[PDB]
Design a protein around this ligand. Structure first.
Ligand SMILES: CSC[C@H](NC(=O)Cc1ccc(N)cc1)C(=O)N[C@@H](Cc1ccccc1)[C@H](O)C(=O)N1CSC(C)(C)[C@H]1C(=O)N[C@H]1c2ccccc2C[C@H]1O
Ligand SMILES: C[C@H](CCC(=O)NCCC[N+](C)(C)CCCS(=O)(=O)[O-])[C@H]1CC[C@H]2[C@@H]3[C@H](O)C[C@@H]4C[C@H](O)CC[C@]4(C)[C@H]3C[C@H](O)[C@]12C
Length: 328
């Protein structure tokens, strides 16, 4: 009764899922991004080097293609893609719907991310008012069409060298989590953002904005908060890049603790260290980056979601959080 889309890990940094566009079931690999609200695929009309190795969309081969042609640009923090709108049947797992998406013809503004990774496009799982072109979210539409029970989706992320994951559309499956599932109300109309007190040792921010974001492969921290965290931490910044290197067993590395009236969520160093044995033996990179929003904000990205099963509920305007089962 729920639609389960398998998630594959890529080099323990990101994860992808597959979906199809067109009646001839043209296959694509997507970053699944709760932080955006547009779907895009690279077109056979693409003029840029990044498209060379990708699965490309051919509207001429799909009888369900409906021409739109309205020009559009998606400006992400990691770069820009541009093209034009198109409409065609989009199949996610065993559910399909006619859907407006962007045919991308220029990916040069999205380098070096695009050529360095094996995804074809991005599938947004955000809120309608964050989309360009007023596109109802896939999950909201599937519910509206009575193809699913609830307008919610869940993420059970894969774990490099242990198990695959699933994006489940339409209901919550017990098999993904253990202990209590705690619901945190959205504090914004159109982001998967919740209020949590943030504690890292003696450093804390009360009632911080926390964005649960599937497309961000880091925990992001306010820059002042990070600078305090790093003081006498025996960590070294990489020349020219906002990444920090540490001995993996550095006994100073702290545990993030995020609390609500409802729940307590922790993130120990094992969840935010990336081994980099190639650069040096016993060295790790912190998957933590400094980033200032206008209101002090943390992004609870991939590292958080690897530990915690997450439920994104449109109807109840909340994020549900529970400890992910280590095995299925
Ligand atoms: C609707 S869309 C426009 C939106 N712009 C904005 O709000 C403009 C904005 C607003 C506030 C700030 N203070 C800065 C920019 C936007 O881009 N939002 C993204 C989420 C976000 C939002 C805000 C900051 C950072 C990230 C999007 O949801 C997302 O996750 N992206 C873009 S493309 C992408 C590859 C799927 C992924 C990405 O860049 N990941 C990289 C990444 C990112 C930060 C730290 C390490 C890493 C490594 C790697 O994982
Ligand atoms: C989102 C933040 C902050 C960016 C910011 O907003 N900085 C300047 C102002 C923005 N504008 C230029 C749009 C405004 C106009 C200038 S003005 O002076 O008027 O403000 C920027 C700063 C450093 C950026 C990361 C690093 O690169 C490394 C890496 C490179 C890959 O490729 C993509 C992934 C990654 C992780 C990057 C993601 C993201 O991208 C970061 C976090």
């Amino acid at each position: 009764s729920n639609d389960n889309i398998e998630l594959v890990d890529f080099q323990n940094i990101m994860f992808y899922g597959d979906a199809e566009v067109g009646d001839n079931q043209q296959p694509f690999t997507f970053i699944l991004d709760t932080g955006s609200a547009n779907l895009w695929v690279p077109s056979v009309k693409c003029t840029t080097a990044g498209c060379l190795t990708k699965h490309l969309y051919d509207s001429s081969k799909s009888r369900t293609y409906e021409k739109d042609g309205t020009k559009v640009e998606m400006n992400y923090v990691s770069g820009t893609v541009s093209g034009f709108f198109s409409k065609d049947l989009v199949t996610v797992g065993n559910l399909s719907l006619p859907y407006k998406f962007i045919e991308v013809i220029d990916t040069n503004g999205f380098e070096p991310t695009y050529t360095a990774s094996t995804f074809d496009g991005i599938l947004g799982l955000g809120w309608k008012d964050l989309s360009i072109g007023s596109v109802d979210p896939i999950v909201v539409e599937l519910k509206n069409q009575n193809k699913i029970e609830n307008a919610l989706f869940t993420f059970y992320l894969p774990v490099h060298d242990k198990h695959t994951g699933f994006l489940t559309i339409g209901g919550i499956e017990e098999r993904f989590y253990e202990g209590p599932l705690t619901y945190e109300k959205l504090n914004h109309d159109l982001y998967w953002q919740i209020t949590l007190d943030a504690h890292v040792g003696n450093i804390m921010l009360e009632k911080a904005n926390c964005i649960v974001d599937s497309g961000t492969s880091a925990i992001t921290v306010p820059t002042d908060f990070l600078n305090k965290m790093l003081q006498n931490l025996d960590v070294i910044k990489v020349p020219f890049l906002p990444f920090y290197v540490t001995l993996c067993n550095n006994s100073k590395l702290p545990t993030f603790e995020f609390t609500s009236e409802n729940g307590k969520y922790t993130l120990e160093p094992e969840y935010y260290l990336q081994h980099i044995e190639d650069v040096g033996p016993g060295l790790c990179m912190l998957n933590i980056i400094g980033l200032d929003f206008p209101v002090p904000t943390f992004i609870l990205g991939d590292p958080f979601m690897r530990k915690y099963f997450t439920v994104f509920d449109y109807d109840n305007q909340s994020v549900g959080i529970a400890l992910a089962k280590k095995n299925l």
